[PDB]
Write a protein that binds this ligand. Sequence first.
Ligand code: CU
Length: 193
Amino acid sequence: KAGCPDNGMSEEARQKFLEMHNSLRSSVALGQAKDGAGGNAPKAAKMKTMAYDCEVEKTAMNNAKQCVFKHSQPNQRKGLGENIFMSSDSGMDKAKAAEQASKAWFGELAEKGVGQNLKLTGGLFSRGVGHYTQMVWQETVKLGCYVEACSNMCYVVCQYGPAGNMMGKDIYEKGEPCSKCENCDKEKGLCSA
Ligand SMILES: [Cu+2]
């Protein structure tokens, strides 16, 4: 989503990654996202808009290029969170891969459930909802992803600027959409500043 190298990642997939993230973040912020723990996830008072970041993309790429389904080590993605995903459809369209990965990550909310308490306790963390929580981490505002076709898998890595999943921190501040920021549409619920 703008001015990134012609590095095997397409502008279509980039757009898809960003759009899924913002959409899903919006749906959560509006109180519209189904929580398998019951009801909908709580409204967010200042859910931030994400922007696509080519520099973040390039560190995600170093992971994706290796074609081993593995979480990179922290110093390989200095100060950035990370989500990973794989499909057996090796030659999958990259925008399609972007959509499937985003849904799989975000799917942890409806399936495993989170609940009304958004403090990231060790207990919540080890429940396996960590791809979701990074997707909707209020303070995370940069996204960079890479989709690599490998021998026997389509391998997808997203990295997240300001890292999320800090233990003890709230995934996001609860409250009515936009109540805690200026540049925000109450029908959308995403803050741009
Ligand atoms: Cu993971």
